[PDB]
Amino acid sequence: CPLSHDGYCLHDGVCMYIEALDKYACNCVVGYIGERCQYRDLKWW
Amino acid sequence: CPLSHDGYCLHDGVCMYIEALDKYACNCVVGYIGERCQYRDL
Numbered sequence: 001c002p003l004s005h006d007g008y009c010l011h012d013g014v015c016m017y018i019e020a021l022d023k024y025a026c027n028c029v030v031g032y033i034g035e036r037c038q039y040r041d042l043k044w045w
Numbered sequence: 046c047p048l049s050h051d052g053y054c055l056h057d058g059v060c061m062y063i064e065a066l067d068k069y070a071c072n073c074v075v076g077y078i079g080e081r082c083q084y085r086d087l
Contacts, residue, residue, distance in 0.1 A: 036087070038084065039084050040055055040056075040079075
């Protein structure tokens, strides 16, 4: 996830290093899913 | 949307009642796809 893009992850998410995923990905807010959190999971609340 | 509680259409979308079918529809905002506007179309 582009650490310079600034607004790469959508819906108030934040690009960072997720250890559990041992990668630099989008850390979305509870509910959203997808590479940049573009999708919403209505089954997850 | 006569519904008392807000949130049927996520992401600033407006809801509407389709009498003929007793079904609810949503008027998502541009860039949003889905029955209730869940998906952002990039």
